[model samples]
Target: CTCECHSPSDGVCECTYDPDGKPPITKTFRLHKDQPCTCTCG
Candidate 1:
């Protein structure tokens, strides 16, 4: 499946503070590598 359990959902989780739990991950798709994507705390 080319996916792992702890590899960060949606492949972009830049959350801060190191959340004590893993929240729902919103899926985002873009071709740019430097573009900003909305990420929730995890």
Candidate 2:
């Protein structure tokens, strides 16, 4: 799992997940100021 912030000022981020023998999955979300985005892969 990995995460990238596209716009810190706007609190926008994108996260990706990779599963074994499967296509990667991605999502976008928003966060508040001084916050960090995290990812979890199962």
Candidate 3:
């Protein structure tokens, strides 16, 4: 997956997961332009 953060040198990240694949998904996180304007994860 690819993530991007632009402008103001700030960014946001949201993550979601389900072992049984359910609903009402609510996962979140915070990111910064620390490393690069864009990043990737798998």
Model 2 Cα lDDT, one tens digit per residue, 8-37: 446777777776677777777887677677
Q: Local error of candidate 3 at 26, Å?
A: 3.0
- Structural similarity to truth (TM-score) of each candidate: 0.18, 0.61, 0.34
Global lDDT for candidate 3?
0.44
Error of 2 at 23 (Å): 0.4
**Which of the numbered candidates is closest to the native, going by highest lDDT?**
2
Q: Which ten residues in a row have the lowest lDDT in candidate 3?
A: 1-10
How do the residues 1-42 of candidate 1 rate in per-residue lDDT, one tens digit apiece?
111122244445332333335543334344246545444432
Weakest 10 consecutive residues, lDDT, candidate 2? 1-10
| Tens digits of per-residue lDDT for model 3, 1-42 | 333434442465554443243543434556655644433433
Q: Can you tell me which runs of candidate 3 are displaced by over 4 Å?
A: 1-10, 21-25, 34-42
Model 1: residues >4 Å from true position, as ranges?
1-25, 39-42
